[PDB]
Scaffold this active site. Structure first.
Site, PDB file in Angstrom:
ATOM      1  N   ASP A   1      36.599  45.491  50.645  1.00 52.16           N
ATOM      2  CA  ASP A   1      37.534  44.430  50.928  1.00 52.16           C
ATOM      3  C   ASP A   1      38.967  44.885  50.633  1.00 52.16           C
ATOM      4  O   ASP A   1      39.176  45.757  49.822  1.00 52.16           O
ATOM      5  CB  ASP A   1      37.206  43.217  50.047  1.00 52.16           C
ATOM      6  CG  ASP A   1      38.069  42.021  50.363  1.00 52.16           C
ATOM      7  OD1 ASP A   1      38.385  41.810  51.547  1.00 52.16           O
ATOM      8  OD2 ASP A   1      38.425  41.283  49.415  1.00 52.16           O
TER       9      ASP A   1
ATOM     10  N   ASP B   1      43.680  46.627  53.444  1.00 54.16           N
ATOM     11  CA  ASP B   1      44.616  46.252  54.502  1.00 54.16           C
ATOM     12  C   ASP B   1      45.989  45.845  53.963  1.00 54.16           C
ATOM     13  O   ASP B   1      47.009  46.446  54.324  1.00 54.16           O
ATOM     14  CB  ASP B   1      44.040  45.173  55.413  1.00 54.16           C
ATOM     15  CG  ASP B   1      43.450  43.958  54.657  1.00 54.16           C
ATOM     16  OD1 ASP B   1      43.587  43.844  53.421  1.00 54.16           O
ATOM     17  OD2 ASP B   1      42.851  43.106  55.332  1.00 54.16           O
TER      18      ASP B   1
ATOM     19  N   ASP C   1      38.852  36.045  56.390  1.00 54.87           N
ATOM     20  CA  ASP C   1      38.711  34.739  55.756  1.00 54.87           C
ATOM     21  C   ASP C   1      38.919  33.581  56.755  1.00 54.87           C
ATOM     22  O   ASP C   1      39.865  32.800  56.659  1.00 54.87           O
ATOM     23  CB  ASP C   1      39.708  34.616  54.590  1.00 54.87           C
ATOM     24  CG  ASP C   1      39.424  35.578  53.451  1.00 54.87           C
ATOM     25  OD1 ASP C   1      38.315  36.169  53.388  1.00 54.87           O
ATOM     26  OD2 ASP C   1      40.335  35.730  52.594  1.00 54.87           O
TER      27      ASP C   1
HETATM   28  O1  LIG Z   1      52.473  36.440  35.841  1.00 57.13           O
HETATM   29  C1  LIG Z   1      51.638  35.304  36.044  1.00 57.13           C
HETATM   30  C2  LIG Z   1      52.207  34.379  37.120  1.00 57.13           C
HETATM   31  O2  LIG Z   1      53.421  33.802  36.610  1.00 57.13           O
HETATM   32  C3  LIG Z   1      54.144  32.974  37.546  1.00 57.13           C
HETATM   33  O3  LIG Z   1      53.429  31.783  37.914  1.00 57.13           O
HETATM   34  C4  LIG Z   1      53.166  30.923  36.788  1.00 57.13           C
HETATM   35  C5  LIG Z   1      51.862  30.222  37.142  1.00 57.13           C
HETATM   36  O4  LIG Z   1      50.801  31.100  36.745  1.00 57.13           O
HETATM   37  C6  LIG Z   1      49.490  30.566  36.994  1.00 57.13           C
HETATM   38  O5  LIG Z   1      49.185  30.346  38.383  1.00 57.13           O
HETATM   39  C7  LIG Z   1      49.222  31.572  39.134  1.00 57.13           C
HETATM   40  C8  LIG Z   1      49.130  31.231  40.619  1.00 57.13           C
HETATM   41  O6  LIG Z   1      47.928  30.458  40.790  1.00 57.13           O
HETATM   42  C9  LIG Z   1      47.648  30.053  42.133  1.00 57.13           C
HETATM   43  O7  LIG Z   1      47.555  31.121  43.101  1.00 57.13           O
HETATM   44  C10 LIG Z   1      46.665  32.160  42.664  1.00 57.13           C
HETATM   45  C11 LIG Z   1      46.171  32.917  43.882  1.00 57.13           C
HETATM   46  O8  LIG Z   1      45.450  31.980  44.709  1.00 57.13           O
HETATM   47  C12 LIG Z   1      44.963  32.553  45.932  1.00 57.13           C
HETATM   48  O9  LIG Z   1      44.103  33.696  45.732  1.00 57.13           O
HETATM   49  C13 LIG Z   1      42.948  33.390  44.965  1.00 57.13           C
HETATM   50  C14 LIG Z   1      41.926  34.502  45.111  1.00 57.13           C
HETATM   51  O10 LIG Z   1      41.307  34.427  46.391  1.00 57.13           O
HETATM   52  C15 LIG Z   1      40.244  35.354  46.525  1.00 57.13           C
HETATM   53  O11 LIG Z   1      39.687  35.123  47.823  1.00 57.13           O
HETATM   54  C16 LIG Z   1      40.732  36.793  46.317  1.00 57.13           C
HETATM   55  O12 LIG Z   1      39.641  37.701  46.222  1.00 57.13           O
HETATM   56  C17 LIG Z   1      41.476  36.912  44.992  1.00 57.13           C
HETATM   57  O13 LIG Z   1      42.019  38.227  44.864  1.00 57.13           O
HETATM   58  C18 LIG Z   1      42.576  35.869  44.971  1.00 57.13           C
HETATM   59  O14 LIG Z   1      43.319  35.900  43.761  1.00 57.13           O
HETATM   60  C19 LIG Z   1      46.134  33.042  46.773  1.00 57.13           C
HETATM   61  O15 LIG Z   1      45.620  33.584  47.992  1.00 57.13           O
HETATM   62  C20 LIG Z   1      46.891  34.127  46.003  1.00 57.13           C
HETATM   63  O16 LIG Z   1      48.019  34.563  46.764  1.00 57.13           O
HETATM   64  C21 LIG Z   1      47.324  33.597  44.634  1.00 57.13           C
HETATM   65  O17 LIG Z   1      47.817  34.665  43.832  1.00 57.13           O
HETATM   66  C22 LIG Z   1      48.773  29.156  42.609  1.00 57.13           C
HETATM   67  O18 LIG Z   1      48.493  28.819  43.967  1.00 57.13           O
HETATM   68  C23 LIG Z   1      50.120  29.877  42.537  1.00 57.13           C
HETATM   69  O19 LIG Z   1      51.148  28.934  42.891  1.00 57.13           O
HETATM   70  C24 LIG Z   1      50.355  30.462  41.131  1.00 57.13           C
HETATM   71  O20 LIG Z   1      51.496  31.336  41.128  1.00 57.13           O
HETATM   72  C25 LIG Z   1      49.329  29.243  36.242  1.00 57.13           C
HETATM   73  O21 LIG Z   1      48.011  28.718  36.430  1.00 57.13           O
HETATM   74  C26 LIG Z   1      50.365  28.211  36.690  1.00 57.13           C
HETATM   75  O22 LIG Z   1      50.258  26.965  35.953  1.00 57.13           O
HETATM   76  C27 LIG Z   1      51.751  28.823  36.516  1.00 57.13           C
HETATM   77  O23 LIG Z   1      52.730  27.954  37.110  1.00 57.13           O
HETATM   78  C28 LIG Z   1      54.486  33.740  38.823  1.00 57.13           C
HETATM   79  O24 LIG Z   1      55.234  32.875  39.705  1.00 57.13           O
HETATM   80  C29 LIG Z   1      53.182  34.257  39.468  1.00 57.13           C
HETATM   81  O25 LIG Z   1      53.426  35.041  40.646  1.00 57.13           O
HETATM   82  C30 LIG Z   1      52.410  35.111  38.459  1.00 57.13           C
HETATM   83  O26 LIG Z   1      51.127  35.471  39.002  1.00 57.13           O
HETATM   84  O1  LIG Z   2      36.302  38.688  46.554  1.00 47.27           O
HETATM   85  C1  LIG Z   2      36.497  37.306  46.907  1.00 47.27           C
HETATM   86  C2  LIG Z   2      36.911  37.220  48.371  1.00 47.27           C
HETATM   87  O2  LIG Z   2      37.986  38.150  48.566  1.00 47.27           O
HETATM   88  C3  LIG Z   2      38.551  38.147  49.871  1.00 47.27           C
HETATM   89  O3  LIG Z   2      39.633  39.069  49.907  1.00 47.27           O
HETATM   90  C4  LIG Z   2      37.462  38.542  50.880  1.00 47.27           C
HETATM   91  O4  LIG Z   2      37.984  38.571  52.199  1.00 47.27           O
HETATM   92  C5  LIG Z   2      36.286  37.567  50.785  1.00 47.27           C
HETATM   93  O5  LIG Z   2      35.244  38.000  51.671  1.00 47.27           O
HETATM   94  C6  LIG Z   2      35.776  37.555  49.340  1.00 47.27           C
HETATM   95  O6  LIG Z   2      34.669  36.661  49.207  1.00 47.27           O
END
Ligand SMILES: OC[C@H]1O[C@H](OC[C@H]2O[C@H](OC[C@H]3O[C@H](OC[C@H]4O[C@H](OC[C@H]5O[C@@H](O)[C@H](O)[C@@H](O)[C@@H]5O)[C@H](O)[C@@H](O)[C@@H]4O)[C@H](O)[C@@H](O)[C@@H]3O)[C@H](O)[C@@H](O)[C@@H]2O)[C@H](O)[C@@H](O)[C@@H]1O
Ligand SMILES: OC[C@H]1O[C@@H](O)[C@H](O)[C@@H](O)[C@@H]1O
Ligand SMILES: OC[C@H]1O[C@H](OC[C@H]2O[C@H](OC[C@H]3O[C@H](O)[C@H](O)[C@@H](O)[C@@H]3O)[C@H](O)[C@@H](O)[C@@H]2O)[C@H](O)[C@@H](O)[C@@H]1O
Ligand SMILES: OC[C@H]1O[C@H](O[C@H]2[C@H](O)[C@@H](O)[C@@H](O)O[C@@H]2CO)[C@H](O)[C@@H](O)[C@@H]1O
Ligand SMILES: OC[C@H]1O[C@@H](O)[C@H](O)[C@@H](O)[C@@H]1O
Ligand SMILES: OC[C@H]1O[C@H](O)[C@H](O)[C@@H](O)[C@@H]1O
Ligand SMILES: [Ca+2]
Ligand SMILES: [Ca+2]
Ligand SMILES: [Ca+2]
Ligand SMILES: [Mg+2]
Ligand SMILES: [Mg+2]
Ligand SMILES: [Mg+2]
Ligand SMILES: [Mg+2]
Ligand SMILES: [Mg+2]
Ligand SMILES: [Mg+2]
Ligand SMILES: [Mg+2]
Ligand SMILES: [Mg+2]
Ligand SMILES: [Mg+2]
Ligand SMILES: [Mg+2]
Ligand SMILES: [Mg+2]
Ligand SMILES: [Mg+2]
Ligand SMILES: [Mg+2]
Ligand SMILES: [Mg+2]
Ligand SMILES: [Mg+2]
Ligand SMILES: [Mg+2]
Ligand SMILES: [Mg+2]
Ligand code: NI
Ligand code: NI
Ligand code: NI
Lengths: 1247, 458
Positions: free
Chosen positions: B395, B398, B457
């Site tokens: 995974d 990209d 996704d």
């Molecule tokens: O250094 C720590 C952080 O500090 C600041 O933010 C404070 C903030 O921290 C905490 O929340 C962090 C973030 O939480 C959410 O987004 C997290 C991710 O969500 C999605 O991805 C989830 C997972 O999906 C799987 O499929 C994948 O395998 C896996 O890798 C992935 O993580 C999004 O797609 C990702 O892009 C996100 O990173 C919130 O949505 C965010 O808004 C938030 O920043 C804490 O809980 C909060 O209360 C607090 O306000 C910085 O701004 C921040 O960048 C940094 O990480």
């Molecule tokens: O690892 C948690 C998730 O990560 C994503 O980046 C992948 O595309 C999903 O298939 C996977 O289930």
């Protein structure tokens, strides 16, 4: 962008045709055609016949074809290559390829305008041909169809299910494949079929091609696709089980997996595999956790049992892999995998460390708008409150961003969340414990429920865009604070140090400079707090000794001002006005106050203007109407003007702070925390104005709401400067709270009285402040301080009646020194129970005692002493040493180790002596520390009584870089051997000048010495202008063509008492073109300044690393340098400098040798010198690590550096220089990983 | 969008004046003026005389003022209300208010074009007057100055450190405060000083008002601010310890907290409080974990011991709170706090549950382009392969999208990641176990290393 030129040569051989094409030059273009199969042509265009670059990984490196036996006819125009399936024609003039079927049908061709060229291929074909390939669509895109008839999408792998490549083909019977790392295919319905390398695409480009290698396929779609697979590779057969059904799952353990498989098998639903997400591995853990089976989720994966049991049920297991490693484990330690990847260079280029999340929870917002909801919220908080949560940090009452979730909280959400805790706590504690909260939004009304406001996730940077553009930094914060005050929320704070950096939590902490300035700023704001991102640290000692000591010093100022500040906390409960306000509150009609944010009022009586600029040598500060007295330096300024304010960029000790004439400022001894003890004496500093002013002193319990029903104490203090006296009224006590204060000590500035009266009684006079403080009952005394004449008046506080004191007459003190009793100063040590102590168990001491317990390593006492100007101050230390022999202590000034004091035995512990040492003090506050520094070889083991600091130095210095610069004059670090943080250059244009503000105690003639450089090779001139008088010529000789040599120009000047201006300017007749470093001023002949003893250039490594220095480096031939200079703020926790902002480091992950060296010619040959440095070493024990002195006329002298992790001082004394010069150096021989830090290196003439 | 009509009735009583205004209908408009202090006037416009709505929580519900004894002269045109500090003139035909200092200096006025109306207030004032209030700036915005002389930013609490409200005032000697749940203040350098309820703001609106309740302040800035605090409330006194230095920290446990406090105390660096982030609580767990001390991080918070030992060292403790509850714990089970909130209706309206994250991990991308890197990657995978991972779900070869981190992998990243496993497995098993992989990107040549493609996704 032009097409190929004429064919000038054509060599056929087997299935290859090599064409030479005219390009004007002797190095002709080459176009190699190779017929690979009957329906597949390779073309390789090599501009100027240069060798081709390596093919990208697109191409199967093992690709192989049988001989075709193609017919190549070079005898005519066009040249013709035929097979049974295609006919290729190349016209000769200019060279253009046409591709046809064997039967003559034209498929595609290079137009007259141009085909192949240095950055791609260009074809024309039937405009109605359907084109395919190029691209697919990802899981975040609009999804189109199959046709690519009008395409300009790039060729890339893309993301999220995308696919792409430089492969364009048609059902009209042809295909084109270009070997490339990304690029830009282009088609349109006029018939174009093109491909461009273009610029570097979004995804980067790591395979660059100087040639153009491409392939032309002829046939039906299956033949085209087969040819594609011949060139780029066929697919190896997958295991047969992979044609079965697979269940991928995230959130799964061994029990659930077994249950799922049983579910399928019981129902005869076929299934061949399960794929396991994060669950299968110890992702997040050390020792390659992201490759290791998670045996908490999958116990039987401890062995091959899980594999074998699943195989027996017909299940194969697939595991998710992420192309990254965890570089910090769940306890913030560097991982083994990090070390292996970092040392071997296995990280993706351009990809830095960042923050991922993999452990989800589900959450939902509560509604604080409902009373029943607030009751519930509070009820569930009670247990946490009982067990120590007494302040509520209410975060994210504003908006959440979580995926599709963009949810806003309403305008009253902060108010109502605050009300839940406020109403709750007040009810539960019966109004017995005051509520404290903070939130990151404010709307009118929220203030009723006891909440402050903080400025949110601000950036760790000096200003918006310094390091990144998406958050403001430090310099923006005063505007946010004062905008909040303009909305009625003056209870404001910020994350001092910043929260956000590039890279998130793993990104850099503030530099020591940024941190120190931010702390000085924060100490003069309402809610004083540090914060940082996850696992970041904000303790001051981590940022080096300047940050530590400057932060401590300003924190002492804030805490001394507790009684002043607290009256504004009460005021906010009566009018909403708080501890800070913008100048426009007091100056509504002043246009220069209208938008002014670089300074603000701290209470009613102090204007503060923190230094917020990086490397700032001076500040412009607007002072509005009135008279202002410099808090730290003592001078007065008339209001209604912008002043130029010099600051010392080398020490970072200045916090520009101005007392407003009229000021009445209660203050107290510094406590470690607010109720550490009862304070029975409150000082009241009074700077009388011709109009009456007042301040109402206030006490209450500090803890409950008892104040709401009268349980507090106040006393109105008022003052007025009259025709020939000062009158101060201490009003009668008021209210039912019994205050701790028993006595006020009034410090009435600007007059040293001959009498002090009250109620028809002249108060008893005492000899000095100490005698007055020790007396029971009222009295007065007089003296001198940084502001000038002062009268002290001790009176009882909390009397039932008003007292009017009148100070009359003028009898100024003859005192030449201020006395600081060290038992009143700041005592510290290595641990809380090993701080320097106070005692009275030997006789003969001044004041109330002396300082002892300077006999445990690290014990210290620190005095904050103000100086009016920078210069040499002989400071007397009174001490006792009954040990029978000499004892040593270090004296530090503004975090620099100035000297090791050798304090002789004084005969007994009750017999006292004095040692006087010339200290380099800076204008304003100075930090003078006497310390048992065992890591510098001090013994400790003496008792200290006081220090005496002269009100005036023996000689003063004024840094040129901090002077008023005009006419193009600027500061620089681009030559060597300047003193202080910089020098002044660009005195080139007529009018260029540096103007110094010089202070004199009395009218008279003073000596000046101006340190300057002139490397033009000839004498140059400036004009000196003293107090705007007639210009005099300053003639400045040159040592030669060398800007790293400095000289003194001596002269005299007639000065007046107080502030003088002395300008050095290029007037019309002057030549200019010199650099200026410093002006020294004295009534006596000027000698070497205490701040200028160091003979090394950039010994403290503080120079901006863009500019070089007299340091050189060495490593073995073929080894990368292991040496650099930086702040250590990128590390977690920081590994900071010994002083100021920067320190040299040696470090490598492999075995290394490294040195730095600096050679200086000494001022006096046949004399004795001394090398001192701060050094810190950690990680692997090196074979050799040492300071070195050599080239001095004797054999090399070595001092070894010892692997600890702590800053130690290394000294090489008694260097007898007979060669005229000395080479000082630092050398490390390491097997790997050893880090040495080096800082504060000095070479001085040694007594 | 029309101004008030003519005055048809004016009843003075004490400090209150009630105006009846013609609107063409049998239900005349009412405008109630109340002189609250010598320098504070409350105006309540009731369209067609309808009952006023409840005031929003902006207004201090316990606010009260002493009698002023203002003079109210309804005998002529304009009607005149006077105190020692201000003179209010209401012209009769049509009804338009002019606000002056007691000395007659004109401060602001409702223009002929129209003043108060059903959706806001409209004033004209000196075009060079400096305006303040309305808004501040958040941690994601360009930060302007104090001046609000050309402002159209909405009045809102905002986010990320912002502050705002329907409060606009001038150093020229006046302020205007409108009771409102959000809305749209407007100023410009022609002298406009206006406020509109407008449409529903971004943040929502839960208090709607049919009337327009506003306050006019007269005086210097400190007087305006004091009057603001009379209307909206003064601030309760905070504990005196809150004037001290505070260390807020995320990533902390009891042993670290003790070492930090010791470090401050040893150095005589004053400090009164530590604020604890997620670390202090069992956020993520059942049974109100997001209210409960985390005794893994802070063992002595099982009882009052931590509190008492910290208090003995002069340290008060602050704890972070989020206005949300965990509705499914770490194990995806519904929590007690979910059932209680769900059954009682305690969730914020319009906010549904959402998956969220709070436990950060530090990572860094590997480079599959290097042979030595591939050899290393495979070597560390052997144990997992032996114990049953026989297919590689590769995974995120990209692009990274994590906070500030937007890092692209190159076009050969999928091929090379696939190669690491393909070359490695074939070597290790002596060509005896076929390779299976999947990735979520494809570029030509990647197929040589035994990988499929999945569509991401979706
Ligand atoms: O250094 C720590 C952080 O500090 C600041 O933010 C404070 C903030 O921290 C905490 O929340 C962090 C973030 O939480 C959410 O987004 C997290 C991710 O969500 C999605 O991805 C989830 C997972 O999906 C799987 O499929 C994948 O395998 C896996 O890798 C992935 O993580 C999004 O797609 C990702 O892009 C996100 O990173 C919130 O949505 C965010 O808004 C938030 O920043 C804490 O809980 C909060 O209360 C607090 O306000 C910085 O701004 C921040 O960048 C940094 O990480
Ligand atoms: O690892 C948690 C998730 O990560 C994503 O980046 C992948 O595309 C999903 O298939 C996977 O289930
Ligand atoms: O080191 C300078 C110091 O010298 C004298 O004090 C020495 C010593 O005196 C006290 O300790 C006495 C004694 O106490 C116990 O019996 C221990 O077991 C012994 O080791 C110890 O010597 C005092 O507590 C110590 O702090 C001190 O070092 C002078 O009297 C001091 O004024 C002077 O500072
Ligand atoms: O890469 C240069 C870097 O080297 C040093 O940091 C070391 C540190 O000393 C080690 O203890 C370990 O943590 O790894 C680090 C390498 O990243 C310097 O201290 C630092 O200033 C410098 O930037
Ligand atoms: O709880 C972790 C972080 O969350 C953010 O929303 C807050 O603004 C920070 O102050 C806090 O440290
Ligand atoms: O004066 C500064 C200069 O000193 C020396 O001549 C150095 O060789 C040069 O690199 C440097 O810029
Ligand atoms: Ca003493
Ligand atoms: Ca200088
Ligand atoms: Ca340094
Ligand atoms: Mg061949
Ligand atoms: Mg090129
Ligand atoms: Mg068509
Ligand atoms: Mg599951
Ligand atoms: Mg079973
Ligand atoms: Mg494990
Ligand atoms: Mg390294
Ligand atoms: Mg200046
Ligand atoms: Mg130069
Ligand atoms: Mg030299
Ligand atoms: Mg009233
Ligand atoms: Mg309406
Ligand atoms: Mg203007
Ligand atoms: Mg921590
Ligand atoms: Mg302890
Ligand atoms: Mg627990
Ligand atoms: Mg339900
Ligand atoms: Ni794409
Ligand atoms: Ni390293
Ligand atoms: Ni806003």
């Amino acid at each position: 962008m032009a097409g190929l030129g004429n064919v000038t040569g054509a060599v056929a051989s087997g299935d290859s045709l090599t064409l030479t094409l005219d390009n004007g030059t002797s190095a002709s273009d080459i176009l190699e055609l190779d017929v690979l199969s009957e329906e597949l042509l390779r073309v390789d265009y090599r501009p100027s016949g240069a060798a081709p670059s390596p093919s990208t990984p697109m191409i199967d490196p093992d690709a192989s074809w049988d001989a075709v036996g193609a017919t190549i006819d070079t005898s005519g125009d066009p040249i013709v290559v035929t097979t049974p399936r295609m006919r290729i024609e190349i016209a000769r003039t200019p060279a253009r390829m046409t591709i046809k079927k064997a039967d003559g049908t034209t498929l595609l061709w290079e137009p007259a305008s141009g085909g192949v060229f240095e950055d791609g291929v260009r074809f024309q074909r039937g405009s109605t041909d359907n084109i395919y390939g190029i691209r697919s669509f990802n899981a975040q895109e609009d999804v189109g169809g199959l046709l690519r008839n009008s395409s300009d999408h790039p060729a890339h792998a893309g993301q999220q299910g995308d696919a792409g490549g430089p492969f364009m083909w048609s059902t009209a019977g042809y295909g084109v494949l270009v070997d490339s790392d990304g690029g830009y295919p282009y088609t349109d319905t006029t018939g174009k079929l093109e491909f461009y390398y273009g610029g570097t695409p979004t995804e980067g480009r790591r395979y660059t091609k100087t040639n153009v290698e491409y392939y032309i396929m002829v046939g039906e779609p299956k033949e085209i696709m087969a040819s594609y697979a011949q060139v780029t590779g066929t697919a190896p057969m997958l295991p047969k089980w992979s044609l079965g059904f697979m269940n991928f799952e995230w959130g799964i353990d061994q029990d659930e997996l077994e249950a799922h498989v049983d579910g399928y098998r019981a129902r005869n639903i076929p299934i061949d595999a399960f794929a396991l997400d994060y669950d299968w591995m110890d992702y997040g853990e050390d020792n390659y956790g992201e490759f290791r089976w998670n045996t908490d989720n999958f116990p039987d994966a401890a062995t091959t049992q899980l594999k074998e049991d699943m195989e027996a049920e017909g299940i194969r297991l697939i595991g998710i892999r992420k192309p990254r490693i965890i570089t910090r484990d769940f306890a913030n330690q560097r991982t083994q995998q990090y070390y292996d990847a970092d040392s071997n260079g296995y990280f993706y280029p351009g990809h830095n460390e960042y923050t991922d999340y993999f452990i989800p929870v589900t959450v939902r917002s509560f509604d604080p708008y409902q009373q029943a909801s607030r009751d519930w919220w509070w009820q569930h908080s009670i247990d946490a409150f009982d067990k120590g949560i007494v302040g509520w940090w209410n975060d994210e009452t504003d908006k959440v961003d979580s995926g599709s979730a963009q949810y806003w909280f309403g305008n009253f959400s902060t108010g109502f969340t605050s009300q839940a805790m406020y109403d709750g706590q007040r009810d539960y504690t019966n109004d017995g414990v005051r509520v404290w909260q903070t939130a990151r939004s404010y709307y009118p009304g929220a203030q009723r429920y006891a909440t402050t406001l903080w400025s949110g996730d601000i950036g760790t940077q000096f200003y918006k865009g310094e390091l990144f553009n998406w958050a403001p930094g430090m310099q923006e914060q005063p505007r946010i604070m004062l905008s909040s005050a303009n909305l009625g929320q003056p209870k404001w704070g910020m994350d001092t140090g910043g929260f956000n950096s590039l890279g998130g939590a793993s990104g850099p902490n503030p530099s020591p400079e940024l941190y120190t300035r931010w702390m000085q700023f924060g100490a003069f704001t309402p809610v004083f707090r540090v914060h940082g991102n996850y696992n970041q640290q904000r303790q001051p000692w981590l940022y080096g000794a300047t940050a530590e000591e400057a932060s401590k010093a300003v924190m002492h100022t804030r805490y001394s001002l507790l009684p002043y500040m607290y009256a504004y906390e009460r005021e906010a409960s009566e009018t909403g006005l708080g501890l800070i306000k913008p100048l426009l509150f007091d100056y509504p009609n002043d246009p220069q106050a209208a938008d002014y944010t670089e300074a603000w009022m701290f209470g009613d009586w102090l204007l503060v203007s923190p230094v917020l600029g990086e490397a700032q040598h001076s500040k412009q500060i607007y002072l509005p109407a009135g008279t202002w007295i410099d808090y730290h330096r003592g001078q007065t300024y008339s209001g209604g003007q912008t002043i130029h304010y010099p600051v010392n960029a080398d020490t970072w000790t200045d916090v520009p702070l101005f007392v407003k004439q009229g000021a009445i400022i209660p203050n107290q001894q510094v406590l470690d925390y607010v109720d550490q003890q009862s304070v029975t004496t409150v000082n009241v500093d009074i700077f009388p104005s011709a109009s009456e002013t007042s301040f109402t002193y206030y006490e209450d319990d500090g803890s409950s709401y008892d104040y709401e029903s009268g349980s507090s104490f106040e006393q109105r203090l008022a003052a007025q400067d009259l025709s020939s006296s000062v009158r101060v009224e201490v009003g009668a006590g008021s209210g039912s709270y019994t205050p701790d204060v028993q006595h006020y000590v009034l410090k009435i500035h600007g007059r040293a009285g001959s009498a002090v009266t009250a109620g028809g009684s002249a108060l008893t006079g005492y000899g000095d402040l100490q005698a007055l403080q020790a007396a029971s009952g009222s009295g007065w005394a007089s003296g001198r301080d940084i502001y000038g004449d002062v009268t002290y008046v001790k009176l009882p506080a909390a009397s039932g009646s008003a007292t009017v004191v009148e100070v009359s007459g003028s009898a100024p003190s003859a005192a030449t020194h201020a006395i600081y009793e060290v038992e009143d100063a700041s005592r510290s040590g290595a641990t809380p129970t090993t701080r320097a102590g106070i005692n009275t168990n030997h006789s003969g001491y001044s004041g109330s005692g002396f300082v002892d317990k300077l006999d445990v390593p690290g014990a210290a006492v620190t005095v904050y002493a103000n100086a009016p100007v920078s210069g040499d101050y002989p400071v007397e230390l009174r001490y006792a040493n009954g040990s029978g022999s000499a004892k040593t202590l270090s004296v530090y000034v503004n975090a620099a180790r100035v000297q090791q004091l050798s304090l002789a035995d004084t005969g007994a512990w009750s017999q006292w002596g004095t040692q006087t040492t010339t200290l380099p003090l800076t204008a304003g506050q100075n930090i003078i520390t006497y310390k048992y520094d065992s890591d510098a070889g001090d013994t400790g083991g003496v008792n200290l009584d006081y220090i005496r600091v002269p009100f005036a130095p023996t000689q003063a210095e004024y840094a040129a870089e901090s002077a008023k610069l005009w006419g193009g004059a600027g500061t620089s670090q681009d030559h060597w051997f300047y003193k202080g943080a910089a020098f002044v250059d660009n005195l080139t244009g007529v009018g260029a000048e540096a103007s110094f503000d010089v202070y004199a105690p009395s009218a008279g003639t003073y000596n000046l010495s101006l340190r300057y450089a002139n490397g033009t090779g000839s004498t140059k001139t400036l004009s000196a202008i003293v107090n705007g008088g007639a210009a005099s010529t300053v003639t400045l000789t040159s040592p030669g063509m060398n800007w790293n040599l400095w000289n003194e120009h001596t002269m005299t000047a007639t000065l007046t008492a107080g502030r003088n201006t002395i300008s050095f300017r290029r007037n019309s007749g002057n030549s200019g073109n010199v650099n200026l470093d410093r002006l020294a001023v004295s009534a006596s002949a000027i000698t070497t300044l205490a701040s200028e003893r160091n003979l090394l250039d950039n010994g403290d490594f503080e120079r901006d690393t863009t500019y070089n220095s007299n340091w050189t480096q060495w490593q073995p031939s073929g080894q990368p340098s292991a040496f650099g200079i930086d702040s250590g703020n990128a590390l977690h926790p920081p590994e900071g400098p010994a002083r100021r902002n920067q320190r040299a480091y040696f470090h490598s992950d492999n075995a290394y040798q490294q040195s730095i060296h600096q050679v200086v010619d000494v001022p006096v040959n046949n004399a004795t010198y001394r090398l001192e440095a701060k050094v810190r070493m950690k990680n692997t024990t090196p074979t050799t690590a040492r300071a070195e002195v050599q080239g001095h006329g004797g054999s090399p002298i070595y001092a070894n550096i010892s692997n600890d992790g702590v800053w130690k001082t290394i000294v090489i004394d008694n260097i007898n220089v007979t060669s005229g010069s000395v080479d000082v150096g630092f050398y490390v021989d390491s097997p790997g990983y050893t880090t040495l830090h080096i800082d504060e290196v000095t070479l001085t003439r040694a007594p």
